[PDB]
């Protein structure tokens, strides 16, 4: 139970413990930063970054969402995605580019 | 006692506290009891402070915008104008504005 | 109304026309680019009004329109709260519903 506690980024500090998914999810707030030119600069925006981390013998993902997003909704969505990834780690994904349709007419009958 | 013991705004009740919370509780009760016929409440002043953050942008954005049509066609019965209005990146507007000039 | 654009057969009119459609006139529009076309009537009888119910086609009025612009007005609000309001208003359960009076 709870294997890795490394905090790869020093600028972000943990705010909740590594709650487990019945993977583990950890919420990290950000420490103080430099001055901003104006207060309407931190939460301004909608793009979300999903940063990938090197595999630690487990994989770590840094997902950052804008402020206005509800933390409960973000946590639930991330938990559902983690459960789906754990279950699935197919031909359906292969169908959606490198399988072709007309070339899939010699093999089925010949 | 104006600048030393208290700040000036709080001392003059410009930004400090409401009358019902800086007056004595007995005086507040008396004013409520005798409000019908003697009305103490006039003599005391409330701060009425305005919010100072997370209300306006101060990021150099305009209030009024003039949009010229991208194209116009006019039969001798109707005058059709086509506009495309870009709603900023973060700002929002209600269409109670946006009158045709 | 007649005196407001002056006396005289010819006059230059600078008027502002609102949006009266129920689904639009109160719509709070979120960020994005929207094509806003509108066709303006040029029929003199519908446009103008006279104390006498005399036909104006035969008399000859021929209203001529030079330019048409719309003027959007934006409340300058902090980008944090603007994006927060956008985030709530983009939600499925926060859809804006209007009625015709």
């Amino acid at each position: 139970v709870v294997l890795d506690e490394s905090n790869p980024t020093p600028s972000y500090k943990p705010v909740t413990e590594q709650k487990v998914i019945l993977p583990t999810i950890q919420v990290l707030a950000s420490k103080k930063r430099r001055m901003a030119e104006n207060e309407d600069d931190r939460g301004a925006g909608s793009v979300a970054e999903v940063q990938m981390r090197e595999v630690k013998p487990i994989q770590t993902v840094d997902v950052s969402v804008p402020d206005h997003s509800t933390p409960m909704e973000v946590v639930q969505s991330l938990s559902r995605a983690a459960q789906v990834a754990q279950r699935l780690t197919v031909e359906a994904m292969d169908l959606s580019a490198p399988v072709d349709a007309k070339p899939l007419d010699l093999k089925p009958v010949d | 006692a104006t600048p030393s013991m208290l700040p000036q705004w709080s001392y003059m009740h410009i930004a400090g506290q409401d009358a019902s919370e800086y007056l004595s509780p007995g005086l507040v009760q008396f004013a409520q009891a005798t409000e019908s016929y003697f009305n103490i409440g006039n003599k005391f002043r409330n701060p009425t402070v305005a919010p100072t953050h997370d209300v306006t942008t101060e990021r150099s954005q305009r209030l009024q915008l003039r949009f010229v049509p991208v194209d116009r066609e006019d039969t001798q019965y109707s005058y059709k104008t086509r506009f495309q209005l870009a709603v900023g990146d973060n700002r929002v507007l209600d269409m109670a504005s946006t009158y045709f000039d | 109304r007649s005196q407001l654009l002056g006396n005289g057969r010819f006059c230059d009119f600078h008027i502002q026309v609102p949006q009266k459609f129920f689904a639009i006139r109160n719509l709070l529009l979120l960020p994005g680019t929207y094509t806003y076309e509108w066709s303006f009537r040029k029929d003199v009888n519908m446009i103008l009004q006279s104390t006498l119910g005399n036909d104006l086609r035969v008399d000859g009025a021929t209203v001529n329109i030079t330019s048409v612009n719309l003027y959007a007005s934006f409340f300058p609000m902090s980008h944090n709260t603007a994006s927060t309001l956008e985030a709530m208003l983009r939600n499925d359960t926060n859809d804006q519903s209007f009625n015709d009076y």
């Binding site: - | 305005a50 997370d54 | 709260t81 009625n99 009076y101």
Partner: peptide
Amino acid sequence: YNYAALAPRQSGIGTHEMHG
């Protein structure tokens, strides 16, 4: 965000106007 924008310091929502 911080509990929405502040109010001026010292039915709310919805309209039901009809009939004609």
